[PDB]
Design a protein around this ligand. Structure first.
Ligand SMILES: Nc1ncnc2c1ncn2[C@@H]1O[C@H](CSCC[C@H](N)C(=O)O)[C@@H](O)[C@H]1O
Ligand SMILES: [Zn+2]
Ligand SMILES: [Zn+2]
Ligand SMILES: [Zn+2]
Lengths: 104, 430, 104, 78
């Protein structure tokens, strides 16, 4: 009789609300640097090659992309809350982009 | 039932707080000090009559309370003595200890307790995994029939055996009225016990253990709940793990699946199979086992180990039958290297010289064991000289002289073996 | 010991006498489960004689046990069974086993 | 390497916006919109660089392109 009682698991949302507070308190970059750099180089390859990209340009691009995605998710969260749901769906993403004017 | 509170308390060293094996264990965020500690935005609500800070109450919107984190004085906007300092202020629910019919001491509510209310902080010594293993082995040697370990987190356990609180006396219920939860107090982790529903005075306080046995045997559950599974542990075990020792079981061709199948077919259908113990061989399992020829030398080594270990007549019968099915010459050469004849001499002697069985059945055994001896490849009496099994054959043909087929088969066998030469062995200086 | 390379390839013993050297090495180590036709056990025995895994006090290898062998009776039995004159070959095998490729 | 924007990373990005639950089909949509935005900004920065007779895109071109799209960025020499 040497067994161990388990602490079980948290409810869905508790660890979500914790990590919400933790990420809204801290300010570091959330996208990994090297995959983002490779993605930027892949997009830039399609126009004209042999194009060097300074580290500061990649960092500025990363900051702008993170700010855009965070704003889009805030708007999509407002859309989901409006439809009496707590889960965001692609239809809310499309609607947010539609009302923002980004999608024609 | 009579109160046993002081008697239960005298059995162990009472603790007011959790003790730590070292300062590194039990720290929140795996020890990563969150210097920006989570401060609730609650405004302090001081009742001027009672002078009590009502902030961070049950129906208040304290984020920390919802996220199972306790406010720390001097860090939160709620001020000191808020209503979310239940662990630190040690404001336990009133409880008593009473002797149960079968479970020993148990905890009962001295007062009616509201839903989601904090009952009591589980107390103990915070220990690492190696210390847990050492203490577990020591307690199993001591024969203790009670769990006193809970998993604080991965690699970090809490022991309630020698030191702790009243919470160690809470008994398992398969439909429990209370539950254990994990909370964060400052940079530390606590394990509390909270009320899952409305509980009245006098009712026993129980929680689901969710036992991780770590290979320990199942313990029957006597909670009395209608939804009881009958055993402690979300780990279907019963006796479908081993019926015979692993080398002996694999010698018979049995594996984990074949040892599972027999117990699943009978024990779950109201037929008795004893608790795991290899001192007594269950002959019915060995008879019902399926037999397939051996083609692996490690299996032959396991067979030789089973011959050297098992004393049962029926296991040896089925191993010899499996050898009869076996016809791979390389496995037989390995058995010769393992000196299978030496083991077969003792197997004969125990059955047809010592008489624990019936003469007809022993005759059937002897006819079933002479055949592969006649069949195996042999090239030199050096093989036999490592066993001198011929002497045993002479003794058993002389004892059972009335059974003439055995005598004639042993005649043919010794005639065949006597034709073989002896392998030359270089003499050594003396 | 069962590998492609051979211990006796670093000695003066001819390949036609490799089984003879392995039988000498196996019989010197007092093994009794050995059979002449089992080359694997012969190789294991000679490997443990020349490169033991736990050598005794102040001994590099088990080659000193060869001096207890009675090579004369072995040569007599070889001459009887196989009509081979190998009396000097047993001595050469013993000397090579005790010290592989001496300076002559 | 659009798959390099991994599922935990986009989960973190959604989590900063205060989102509690995430649909399983949303990740391809976020990858698509991020690709579209990056495509536009990278295109404008590249033609800015090509007008500047340079072979290396600097941070100034990026900040210029972003500010011309009404997404002014502070902190990179603007
Ligand atoms: N419902 C139940 N029926 C039988 N034993 C139980 C049980 N619930 C808990 N136990 C036993 O109690 C142990 C937990 S420690 C609980 C207090 C201790 N049994 C005492 O009376 O002093 C468990 O290991 C289990 O063996
Ligand atoms: Zn609060
Ligand atoms: Zn508080
Ligand atoms: Zn039960």
């Amino acid at each position: 009789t040497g067994g161990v009682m388990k602490p079980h698991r948290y409810r869905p949302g508790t660890v979500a609300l914790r990590e919400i507070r933790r990420y809204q308190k801290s300010t570091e970059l959330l996208i990994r640097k090297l995959p983002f750099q490779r993605l930027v180089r892949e997009i830039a390859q399609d126009f004209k090659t042999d194009l060097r990209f300074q580290s500061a340009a990649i960092g500025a691009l990363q900051e702008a992309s993170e700010a855009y995605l965070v704003g889009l998710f805030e708007d999509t969260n407002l859309c989901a809350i409006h439809a009496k749901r707590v889960t965001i769906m692609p239809k809310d993403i499309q609607l947010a982009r539609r009302i923002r004017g980004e999608r024609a | 039932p009579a109160d046993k509170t002081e008697e239960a308390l005298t059995t162990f060293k009472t603790l007011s707080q959790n003790s730590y094996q070292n300062k590194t264990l039990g720290n929140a965020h795996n020890g990563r000090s969150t210097a920006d500690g989570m401060s609730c935005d609650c405004e302090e609500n001081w009742d001027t009559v009672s002078g009590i800070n009502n902030a961070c109450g049950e129906y208040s919107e304290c984020i920390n309370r919802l996220t199972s984190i306790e406010c720390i004085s001097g860090t939160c906007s709620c001020g000191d003595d808020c209503q979310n300092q239940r662990f630190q202020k040690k404001q336990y629910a009133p409880i008593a200890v009473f002797e149960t019919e079968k479970k020993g001491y148990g905890v009962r509510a001295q007062a009616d307790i509201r839903q989601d209310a904090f009952i009591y902080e589980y107390l103990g010594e915070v220990i690492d995994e190696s210390t847990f293993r050492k203490r577990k082995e020591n307690y199993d040697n001591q024969g203790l029939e009670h769990f006193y370990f809970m998993m604080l987190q991965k690699g970090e356990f809490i022991d309630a055996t020698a030191k702790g609180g009243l919470g160690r006396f809470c008994n398992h219920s398969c439909r429990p009225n209370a539950y254990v939860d994990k909370w964060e107090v400052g940079n530390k982790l606590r394990m509390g016990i909270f009320a899952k529903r409305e509980i009245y005075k006098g009712e026993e306080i129980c929680f689901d253990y969710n036992v991780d046995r770590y290979g320990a045997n199942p313990q029957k559950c006597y909670c009395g709940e209608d939804n009881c599974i009958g055993f402690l542990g979300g780990r279907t075990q019963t006796d479908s793990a081993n019926i015979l020792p692993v080398p002996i079981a694999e010698a018979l061709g049995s594996t984990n699946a074949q040892e599972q199948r027999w117990v699943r077919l009978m024990k779950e259908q109201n037929k008795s199979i004893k608790a795991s113990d290899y001192s007594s061989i269950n002959e019915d399992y060995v008879n019902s086992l399926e037999m397939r020829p051996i083609a692996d030398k490690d299996e032959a080594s396991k067979v030789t180990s089973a011959l050297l270990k098992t004393q049962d007549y029926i296991i040896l019968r089925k191993l010899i039958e499996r050898v009869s099915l076996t016809k791979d010459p390389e496995v037989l050469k390995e058995i010769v290297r393992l000196r299978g004849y030496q083991c077969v001499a003792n197997i004969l002697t125990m059955i047809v010289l010592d008489q624990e069985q019936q003469q007809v059945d022993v005759e059937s055994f002897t006819l079933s064991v002479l055949d592969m001896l006649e069949s195996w490849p042999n090239s030199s009496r050096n093989r036999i000289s490592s066993s001198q099994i011929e002497s045993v054959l002479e003794s058993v043909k002389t004892k059972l002289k009335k059974i003439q087929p055995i005598g004639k088969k042993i005649n043919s066998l010794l005639n065949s073996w006597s034709k073989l030469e002896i392998s030359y062995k270089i003499p050594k200086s003396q | 010991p069962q590998g492609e390379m051979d211990l006796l390839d670093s000695t003066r013993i001819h390949p036609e006498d490799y089984s003879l050297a392995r039988k000498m090495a196996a019989d010197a180590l007092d093994i009794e489960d050995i059979d002449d036709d089992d080359e694997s056990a012969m190789r294991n025995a000679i490997y443990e004689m020349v490169f033991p895994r736990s050598p005794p006090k102040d001994e590099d290898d088990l080659t000193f046990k060869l001096d207890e062998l009675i090579l004369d009776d072995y040569a007599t039995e070889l001459e009887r069974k196989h009509q081979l004159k190998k009396r000097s070959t047993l001595q050469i095998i013993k000397e090579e086993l005790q010290s592989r490729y001496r300076e002559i | 390497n659009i798959q390099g924007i991994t599922k935990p990373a986009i989960r973190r990005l959604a989590r900063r916006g205060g989102v509690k639950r995430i649909s399983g089909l949303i990740y391809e949509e976020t990858r698509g919109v991020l690709k579209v935005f990056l495509e536009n900004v990278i295109r404008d920065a590249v033609t800015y660089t090509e007008h500047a007779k340079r072979k290396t895109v600097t941070a100034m071109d990026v900040v210029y392109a972003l500010k011309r799209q009404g997404r002014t960025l502070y902190g990179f020499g603007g």
